[PDB]
Amino acid sequence: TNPPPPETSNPNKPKRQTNQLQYLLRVVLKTLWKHQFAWPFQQPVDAVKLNLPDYYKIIKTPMDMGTIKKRLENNYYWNAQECIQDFNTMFTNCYIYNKPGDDIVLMAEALEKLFLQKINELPT
C-alpha cells in the first residue's frame, strides 16, 4: 500500500552550499521540526499502519519533513526555491487529503504560518 519514499540524494550533482540553504536547514526546517505539531509530518505517511487505503490514490507527490531534512543534509537542492517547493508540496498534500478543520489541518496551518514567517526573512 505504501510507495517507496522519495529519493534524498542526487549523485551527479555538484555540491553547492549557500547561506540561503543553510538558513533553510538550520532556521526554517529546524523551527518546524522542533515544534509540538511536527510529529505527523516528520516521516512519510504510513498508510498501512494508519489504515488509509486511499491516501496514495489521492496524493500523487508524497512529501514530508524527514525527506526535506535529508535532502538538505545531502545538498540535494540547487537553490532555495526547490526546497521551498517541497515544503509547499507537503502542506498541499495535507490540505487536499484531509477535511478542512481536522486536527492535522489545524496543525498544518500553524506550521505553515511559521514557515512563511521564516521564509520572509530568507537572507539575500
Partner: peptide
Amino acid sequence: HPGKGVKSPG
C-alpha cells in the same frame, strides 16, 4: 474517507 482522526501536540 474518514481522514486521520485525533492529533495531540507532541
